[PDB]
Amino acid sequence: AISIKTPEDIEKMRVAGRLAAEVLEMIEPYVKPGVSTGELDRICNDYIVNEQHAVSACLGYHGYPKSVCISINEVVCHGIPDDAKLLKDGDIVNIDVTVIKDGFHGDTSKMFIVGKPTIMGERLCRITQESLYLALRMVKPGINLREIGAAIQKFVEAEGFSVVREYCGHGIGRGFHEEPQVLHYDSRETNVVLKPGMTFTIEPMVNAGKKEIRTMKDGWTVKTKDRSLSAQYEHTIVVTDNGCEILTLRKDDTIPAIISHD
Ligand SMILES: O=C(O)c1ccc(-c2ccccc2Cl)o1
Ligand SMILES: [Mn+2]
Ligand SMILES: [Mn+2]
Ligand code: NA
């Protein structure tokens, strides 16, 4: 079944979420032309281990070889940090972090635009983040995840973009991926009504082109089949009595931590 976090667990999630968000805030200045994704990963891991006294939940997860996932341009997700992969002017890059602290996971990612942004890159990232934001604003007890997934897809598709179907958001807590699955599109299979205390992620993967993807032969790197740009933003949240609280909010987020309804 689905778990409803206790006040104590929610506090631990706040701590874990804050740490994950802080890794993204910390790494930002390093995401510039010339840097390798491999070094960004090491910088993130050193910070997580030595500064936050936490641990990356990604390393070893289903065999994932690195500490954080770094995906560039057409790479949709699971990009493997490589000391030989350099960021360049115009690149859009997603750094996805998941830390475990005091037994709980904080999961979040954001897009970084490297050097001079390309209007398409800016547009895709902005729209992708806005799709996450619109979804967050819908979160509150009584709402069905199907409605949220449908809303995300409708928005994204109205922009001329597509939503990746192979991946979804997820419940989170002592487990990296717990129930329920949080699809970012409309599916007849989705029937999960939100309840206070639920902690999960919303992390839409949006392609500028077609939805189809391909996994490279390193068994991890996923790219858009048409090699169009793909962007993703992710936040871990806790459903409150009248909305939700974003546990991985950053200083650069343009949405409040506490979203209240009435
Ligand atoms: O939920 C996430 O944000 C996420 C990022 C990477 C993964 C993942 C999924 C499946 C196998 C390995 C990994 Cl690292 O999951
Ligand atoms: Mn993630
Ligand atoms: Mn996630
Ligand atoms: Na991408």
**Residue 150 CB: number of other CB atoms within 10 A?**
18
Domain of 205? 1-262
C-alpha dist (Å) from residue 137 to 9, 90, 95, 232:
23, 30, 23, 17
Domain with residue 219: its CATH number is 3.90.230.10
Give the CA angle between residues 13, 27, 227 to the nearest 5°: 100
Residue 69: CB within 6 Å of ligand 1? yes
Q: Considering every ligand atom, which ligand is closest to the CA of 112?
A: 4
Number of separate domains in the chain:
1
Contact status, residue 171 vs residue 3, Cβ threshold 8 Å: yes
C-alpha of residue 87 to centroid of ligand 3, in Å: 23
Q: Is the CB of 96 under 6 A from ligand 1?
A: yes
Q: How far is the CA of 78 from the centre of ligand 1 (A)?
A: 7
CB of 251 closer than 8 Å to CB of 109: no
Using CB atoms within 10 A of its CB, is residue 29 exposed (0-12), middle (13-18) or buried (19+)?
Answer: exposed
CA-CA distance, 115 to 91, in Å (whole number)?
Answer: 8
- Type and span of the H or E element at 106: strand 104-113
Closest ligand 1 atom to Cα of 63: 12
Resolution of the experimental model, in Å, one decimal = 1.5
Residue 67: enclosing H or E segment and its boundaries? Answer: none
Pocket residue to mutate for ligand 1, from 45, 56, 77, 220, most atoms within 8 A of Cβ:
77
CA–CA dist 247, 87 (Å, integer): 29
Give the residue carrying structure tokens 């281990």: 49
Nearest Cα residue to 204 out of 190, 179, 184:
184
Q: Which atom of ligand 1 is nearest to the CA of 169?
A: 1
- Report whether 249 contacts 232 (CB < 8 A): no
Question: How is residue 228 annotated by DSSP?
Answer: -
Q: Which amino acid is at 135?
A: A
Query: Which residue intervals of the chain are DSSP H helices?
Result: 7-27, 37-46, 119-138, 145-158
- Approach to solving: X-ray
